[PDB]
Design a binder for this molecule. Structure first.
Ligand SMILES: [Zn+2]
Ligand SMILES: [Zn+2]
Ligand SMILES: [Zn+2]
Ligand SMILES: [Zn+2]
Ligand SMILES: [Zn+2]
Ligand SMILES: [Zn+2]
Ligand SMILES: [Zn+2]
Ligand SMILES: [Zn+2]
Ligand SMILES: [Zn+2]
Lengths: 9, 236, 236, 236, 8, 9
């Protein structure tokens, strides 16, 4: 449901 | 515990300060109606796109003052700036917030009373003064602002970082739900006879996040507004 | 909402200050009868020939003060100069006004109490002091002056720049209608029992521009005077 | 002696300070409900992994003041920072604690009023001042915080180091159980007519450790929480 | 309303 | 009952 730009490094 | 459903909801500084900053009948806390903002928050080893909204405001204990005689004196006590001493110890990972997050406060009609950088950084003590006359015993409280956060994708790396947290899987991603507290340049001196039992950080986290918020349905006593992701006025 | 049609119209400082700066019966706001002026206003990537006129004046919340005893003390609080903190965050594009715009105030019989350059620039905090005696709780308000603007041809480039705006096509050109707020070196300290609920920037914008002004007919609770374009006394 | 079962249990600074800091009816002491932390404490020739928890708080005697006339004067008395003078002399081995142990206070809702470096180091005298009017005789007390410690494996080397101690064999290992005390930036000034007999370190150790705590069963008037070893929020 | 303004 | 890392040196 919530949008994101975060890429788990 | 169930007392948290009895606390009212307040919007803006006038309503919050008016409610809490009463020397005659001081109040433990109140829920806060505020806007949701989106931007980076550093947790552990990297930044995460986090959804932040104000959720609660409560009176943190400062000091008990004893004046045994009918003597006018000048009081020296010390308050804190930035994140609370309780929040600081409750996190084990590296934690850093950019000062531009204060759009959450501006948008929710809240002003900490400290500078943008002072407000969201490490806990710092400072001296404040008040002219007081006895005889009597007095209790000093300082206003604390509680925020609910959704640190997107952080849950896999930083679940164990916070003492009270909630994970929520959104596809291949694991969201992290936690609470943070910053202090305000607002204090109240109450006579001991009128003094209220202050809430602590453990009770506020147990009741606000753990008992009154469901990440799965984004519901409970409050809910996040995910539309912040598409509003430039609500992104930092 | 419909309370805005109940607020009176005031002309010049004597009427405005007399109405708002009442410590026994504080007033939320009032409409302002003011002259229209024409000149450049920088929005986004260039200057635009803008029509500016005062339209409203309201009491902005500053702080809640608590004095628990019959003690005479000195109060230290923070007021602001220039554009309001609420306006500054409400704009995403580059925004700059030339100090010569202050002819609007001289004409409309208003004096901010700050220097021409101080009045129309970025929000700047400053310390003010008042001798106060308790016991009691007090609310501090600062006067805010609202202006209605028609930034000619800006609507195509900067429609999305402001949180509350209105576009109006005039031929091949797109006019931009928005509101701006500045502060005055005028403050009122009211006992909390007499304190009035302060209006905020979102309410003021929703009601003054969005609900009480029609760009198409140049009518509503106020209207611009386009004759400013041909008056040298009303051009900067 | 058996008076120790009559003292109440208090949790957090609000409850502790509220109870002890009463100029009308001062109280000798109270048991303290607090968190258990794990980390190094230097005793004798090395560091030992120690379990620490707050267990008691009492009013330590400072001075008796005599004002024979109806004259308003300014008092000058000496208070101390860090470990109490009684604790310092009660230990014969080298004793050192790292400031990071203060998590025990944050977690147990306690704040000494000193910096965490001052709080846990050597006893240091300092001057405090109070405006007083006579005629009368007055007694000044300062708050002392008592901690119970389990210095793991220290029992074989440092049994004789402390005047009051308890050893407990856990396999091939010998645990050391002792008590330590530090002062708070908190004092009460009582008219000698209302003055209470202060407890001393000798009595507090005999009753809190020797009479009300059993190392084997980890029971009595209080008990350690060994789960601190696995909590990163409770390790320093 | 009269004007001199244009997009650049 | 209590866990430890301590050893006599
Ligand atoms: Zn990012
Ligand atoms: Zn608790
Ligand atoms: Zn927007
Ligand atoms: Zn131009
Ligand atoms: Zn609003
Ligand atoms: Zn003219
Ligand atoms: Zn070690
Ligand atoms: Zn003795
Ligand atoms: Zn933990």
């Amino acid at each position: 449901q919530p949008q994101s730009h975060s890429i788990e490094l | 515990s169930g007392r948290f459903d009895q606390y009212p909801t307040k919007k803006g500084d006038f309503a919050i300060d008016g409610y809490l900053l009463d020397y005659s009948s001081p109040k433990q806390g109140c829920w806060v109606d505020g806007i949701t903002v989106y931007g980076d928050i550093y947790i552990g080893k990297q930044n995460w796109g986090t959804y932040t909204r104000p959720v609660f405001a409560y009176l943190q204990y400062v000091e008990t003052i004893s004046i045994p005689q009918n003597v006018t004196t000048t009081l020296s006590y010390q308050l804190t700036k930035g994140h609370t001493r309780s929040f600081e110890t409750s996190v084990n990972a590296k934690y850093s917030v950019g000062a531009n997050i204060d759009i959450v406060n501006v948008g929710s009609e809240i002003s900490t009373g400290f500078t943008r950088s002072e407000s969201w950084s490490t806990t710092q003590s400072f001296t404040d003064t008040t002219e007081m006359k006895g005889p009597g015993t007095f209790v000093i409280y300082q206003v604390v602002l509680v925020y609910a956060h959704n640190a997107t994708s952080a849950g896999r790396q930083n679940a164990n970082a916070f003492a009270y947290s909630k994970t929520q899987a959104v596809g291949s991603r694991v969201d992290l739900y936690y609470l943070s507290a910053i202090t305000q340049r607002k204090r109240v001196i109450v006579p001991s006879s009128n003094a209220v039992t202050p809430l602590d950080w453990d009770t506020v986290q147990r009741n606000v996040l753990m008992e009154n918020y469901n990440p799965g349905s984004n519901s409970g006593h409050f809910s996040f507004d995910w539309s912040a992701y598409n509003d430039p006025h609500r992104r930092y």
